[PDB]
Amino acid sequence: EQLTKCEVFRELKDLKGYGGVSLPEWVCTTFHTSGYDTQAIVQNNDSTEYGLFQINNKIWCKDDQNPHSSNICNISCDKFLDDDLTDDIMCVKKILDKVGINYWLAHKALCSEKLDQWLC
Ligand SMILES: [La+3]
């Protein structure tokens, strides 16, 4: 499920300001993270990351690969592969509360400058 820049901008409104992250930062960060693909999956050895925000199955969500996940967002990872970003955003806030925006490696490098390019 491929979102446009403006759909992402609108669908992430409830993350505006959280941990000091601006909406243009969130649009920029999800672009570099998932290419606005809500069905995005990436694996690194025994780790899998799910959805627009690429939330991992070691700490944040449970799945069949890692049923012993810390599951801190108390959710099945497959809930991050649907079109509705409500529970994705609830989990992102818990990640921000516990680890911060640096969870998203793309953020510090690619999403500090010309943030005005990420407005709808
Ligand atoms: La969802």
Numbering used by the authors: 1 to 120
Manuscript excerpt for this entry:
In our study, we obtained bovine α-lactalbumin complexed with lanthanum ion (La3+-B-α-LA) and determined its high resolution crystal structure. The natural calcium binding site of bovine α-lactalbumin is replaced by lanthanum. The structure of the complex La3+-B-α-LA is composed of four α-helices and three antiparallel β-strands. The structure can be divided into α and β sub-domains and the presence of a cleft region clearly demarcates the existence of these two sub-domains.
